[PDB]
Amino acid sequence: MDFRVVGPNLPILAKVGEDALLTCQLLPKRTTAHMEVRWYRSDPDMPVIMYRDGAEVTGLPMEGYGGRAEWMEDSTEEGSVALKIRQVQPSDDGQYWCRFQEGDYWRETSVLLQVAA
């Protein structure tokens, strides 16, 4: 009950082949060294990409998924975050959940993104 993420963000419209912007608002306790943030593409079972210890996971070299998604921090800088995803498609069209994980307690919320087809 010490962390909360909200999805007040308005629907995002990006055309197929154009990049999209996933966004949600979270409040870090202090230093995101141990904080983890996960985004899901209409599939909570598997995360597309994650942000941990102030860095996004790249895994193996020439990352297809990691390469596709790059973190773009919001201008407001009030605990909000945004993730830039390249070459959107109908599969992207839908909802994405942000997952704030710290210690043994975490919370998540959906963000509205509707890409043009």
d(CA 93, CA 111) in angstroms, rounded, equals 11
DSSP 11: P
Give the start-to-end residue ranges of the domains of the chain. 1-117
d(CA 96, CA 17) in angstroms, rounded, equals 19
d(CA 7, CA 114) in angstroms, rounded, equals 14
Burial class (CB within 10 angstroms; exposed 0-12, middle 13-18, buried 19+) of 41: buried
Q: Are strands 20-26 and 80-85 parallel, antiparallel or unpaired?
A: antiparallel
d(CA 81, CA 106) in angstroms, rounded, equals 17
d(CA 54, CA 3) in angstroms, rounded, equals 17
d(CA 95, CA 85) in angstroms, rounded, equals 14
Q: CB 97: neighbour CB atoms within 10 A?
A: 20
CB contact at 8 A, 20 and 115: yes
Q: Residue 88 corresponds to which tokens in the numbers above?
A: 């959107």
CB contact at 8 A, 76 and 8: no
CB half-sphere exposure, 3, CA atoms < 13 A = 23
Distances (CA, A) of 93 to 2, 35, 40, 64, 70: 31, 27, 12, 19, 18
